[PDB]
């Protein structure tokens, strides 16, 4: 189930991620990245381009 | 400007990310992660909890 | 049945303030309410429909 | 105080949480509860009752 | 018929609703809340998922 | 604390909610309904008219 | 059965109804109650519970 | 206090079916619910704002 | 408070009005006309042209 | 095609109607009443209670 | 100036207008044009360009 | 083809101001634009669907 | 006045609009498109950012 | 290709769009307007009525 | 002025199909349209407002 | 064919792109153009014209 990767987010988006961990809304940097991916995943699923690429 | 990190996304979300690179909508895995973070960033900014934590 | 979770201190403070407001009786009630929101959001999600 | 919490979910809500972990979108049971707590937090913040 | 632990802020909310005069009894307020919850439950995407 | 006349269809609705397991007690269901009603009341334009 | 109904509104709801009649948008107390009943009827018809 | 209104037969049948469903206890409860909807709609209306 | 008028609605809209009285949702033809006027009144009030004509 | 009726609108709604004729948006009182009925007709058609009464 | 206007609608738009009159919802061709002018007036008033 | 209509003075003033703004070339162009709005609104209307 | 390269599919679109009879000339169609673009531009949040 | 009477306010609007630098030529602006009009036309309920 | 970008093959195919449809004249026109969408989305974004 | 493209943006659109890169949300000019192309792609896919 586990799987790591190393990404370049850049400094500003890294600071965004650390701020979210600092707030305690998320436990780890990975959790923040996963929440962002889940959000992008929900947007991809319901996108008209996914509905188009299906038919 | 550049800044890397290593995250655990897990297998299923990693497969989601690779599918987006495979589609050619994105060039790299980092680009996908950055797009997800930008999306989470826009949601955080306009969230009523950011407006509340401000005042 | 019971689940042991790491909420962190800040989210615990959020949970406890919901309890002291009186709108919830217990910490577990607040969590069940949060899980009901997520269950409804998950079920109605476009990704829910796509996976089926 | 504690960063750890033991919650009476009942078997059905527990089965819901374990399913999201099985689906691989969440890594741990804890991550699922935090996601639902974040939803509730945003809702209570933007509630007209909070205003 | 039914006895429920509301806590006293929720009791105050209900009594305030009766004091406004939009409601006649405490029981009317609880029925209204449950009708609200019943409508939300029925229209839930998760109730659509379970009994489409 | 509070005793309310729900009628028995409303009782069945509540018990069905407890039977689903999204809720632990009948009291939790009524609290949830009242939180729903409390949020709607507070956000009412009429509550904005009375206490803008 | 009856086309007539006697309703316990309480003084505040009664004051609301008499105000709409005073405002001239409604002619009678009855017209106000029918307007509110029409609202409830449309809501219950289009309720997901009605589906 | 009590008001005597002409609802007509069909709207009475609507009121009574709401009562037999059990979601409401009395005919007067159904009417108060209808008047609460209209009060909220009136208060939030653009014509409400214009008149003040 | 009372005030009558005689209007030409035409046949089709008259049939619409009578159908609404027949349904019992309304007691009289006047009630139907008044409900229609209240609806047109609420639309006029919140119309951007009423907001414009004000300033 | 033509068809008259005499309605009691009351004073306040009559003043509303005359104001709309005075503005020149409508030529006659009948036109105002007809516009109100068309509006109520469109609302009735798409109402869930018309969809329910159909099935 | 004039309360009367002669408009080049073309046959298709004219057929649209005569149809609304045939349907009985409008009494005259003029009433139809005023209804469309009222729509345009509301749109131009509430246009962000008008702000 | 041509239609002779009674617009009244005020609506004529509205039509003519649209022409002097330059967004429309002729009085008839403004009217055709108004009729296009009404045609689209009519076609999409719930009463359009009901009649068919 | 103005000469523009539309390409011939866009020319066909315009001529089709004139053929429907909702429009009288090709120029009317282009004016309508530019009014559409003018309204969108004015209401743009970016036009609000530049000239709030 | 196509020559159109825009009037000079509409010409100014187009040239202003080219002056902003979001657009390169006057022709690009007109194409953009026609794409806007083409999308609105296609999605029209009246285009759904004619070619559902 | 000119910018050299890595679009990848698939997005190029998307750009070129937009050009062959005739709705756009050049590959650069398609890109400017994409950048106008992003500029408008950026300017209106809640994060735009927060940063100022 | 080419994965590379040279685009006439003009200085203003170029300044817009370089600004998003300066803001650190995007790493490269290319990433910005792909983001805008993704927006256009979703819009054209879900266009009623595409249906």
Residue numbers in the entry:
A (entry chain C), B (entry chain C), I (entry chain C), J (entry chain C): 2 to 56
C (entry chain A), H (entry chain A), L (entry chain A), O (entry chain A): 4 to 55
D (entry chain D), G (entry chain D), K (entry chain D), P (entry chain D): 2 to 52
E (entry chain B), F (entry chain B), M (entry chain B), N (entry chain B): 5 to 56
Question: What do the authors report?
Answer:
Recently, PrpTA was found to be a pMBL6842-encoded type II TAS with the unique function to regulate the plasmid replication in Pseudoalteromonas rubra. In this study, we reported for the first time the high-resolution structure of the PrpT:PrpA2:PrpT heterotetramer and two forms of crystal structures of truncated antitoxin-PrpA2–54. In addition, PrpA could also competitively bind to the iteron sequences in the ori, interfering with the binding of replication initiator RepB to the ori site, thus preventing the overreplication of the plasmid.
PrpA2–54-form I and II crystal structures both contain a doughnut-shaped hexadecamer formed by eight homodimers organized in a cogwheel-like form via inter-dimer interface dominated by salt bridges and hydrogen bonds. The maximum diameter of the annular doughnut-like hexadecamer is ∼80 Å and that of the hole in the center is approximately 22 Å. Since the dimer–dimer interfaces in AD-BB# and AD-CC# are similar to each other with an overall r.m.s.d. of 1.05 over 144 residues, only the AD-CC# interface will be, thus, discussed at length here. As demonstrated in Figure 6A (left), a functional PrpA2–54 tetramer is defined by inter-dimer crystallographic contacts between RHH domains with positively charged DNA-binding surfaces exposed to the solvent environment. Salt bridges and hydrogen bonds below 4 Å are distributed mainly through the α 1–α 2 turn and α 2 helices of molecule AD together with almost equivalent parts of a molecule CC# [Figure 6A (right)]. In addition, the interface generated by AD and CC# dimers covers a total surface area of ∼1100 Å2, which is a little smaller than that of the dimerization interface. However, the inter-dimer interface of PrpA2–54 displays a novel feature that all monomers could participate in the formation of tetramer suggesting a much more extensive and strong contact.
